[PDB]
Amino acid sequence: HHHHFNLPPGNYKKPKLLYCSNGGHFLRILPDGTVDGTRDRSDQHIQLQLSAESVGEVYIKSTTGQYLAMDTDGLLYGSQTPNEECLFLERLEENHYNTYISKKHAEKNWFVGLKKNGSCKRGPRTHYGQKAILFLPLPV
């Protein structure tokens, strides 16, 4: 592998919000395929349903059935169908948080990450050690 295998506790039985304390945003996947973060906890597009393919690998699906994905240039988008860009390595980080690494671009260490302003970070701009990549799964 290219990454450690410390896994977070928790299951995928129910949907979850993914909160980033970097800017205080919940990860959001809009029906138009746009991905960003919002502080509005009443938002109807922050409820995410995760599911595991292989141990430690996950799909992250929006309320409308879209799949979080990272494209060839490191930009997150919501895909209508599951493809190789939709698999993420879900890992425990700092003994507490959840991080999501693009499986397809794992060797480049590209993570799901939210900037302090709520915009998504592009793959190459993410790195181990940033607060932007740290998420806390929360009940809806």
Q: Residue 40: name the closest of 59, 22, 27 by CA.
A: 27
Per-residue exposure over 73-92, b if at least 16 CB sit within 10 Å of its own CB, e if not = ebebbbbeeeeebbbbbbbb
Cα dihedral 81/106/111/88 (nearest 10): 40
- For 60-118, the DSSP string reads EE-TTS-EEEE-TTS-EEEESS--GGG-EEEEEETTTEEEEEESTTGGGT-B--B-TTS
Token pair of 59, please?
A: 């799909």
Q: Residue 62: name the closest of 86, 90, 95 by CA.
A: 86
22 annotated to bind ligand: yes
20 beta partners: 25
3-state secondary structure of 51: strand
Rounded CA gap, 98 and 94, in Å?
A: 9
Considering Cα of 60, then 19, then 102, then 120, what sign does the dihedral take? Answer: positive
Which phi and psi angles does 106 have, rounded to 5°?
Answer: -55, -40
Q: What's the reported resolution, in angstroms, to a tenth? A: 1.9
Quick count: other Cβ atoms within 10 Å of Cβ 18? 23
- List the domains of the chain with CATH numbers: 1-140 (2.80.10.50)
Q: How was this model experimentally determined?
A: X-ray
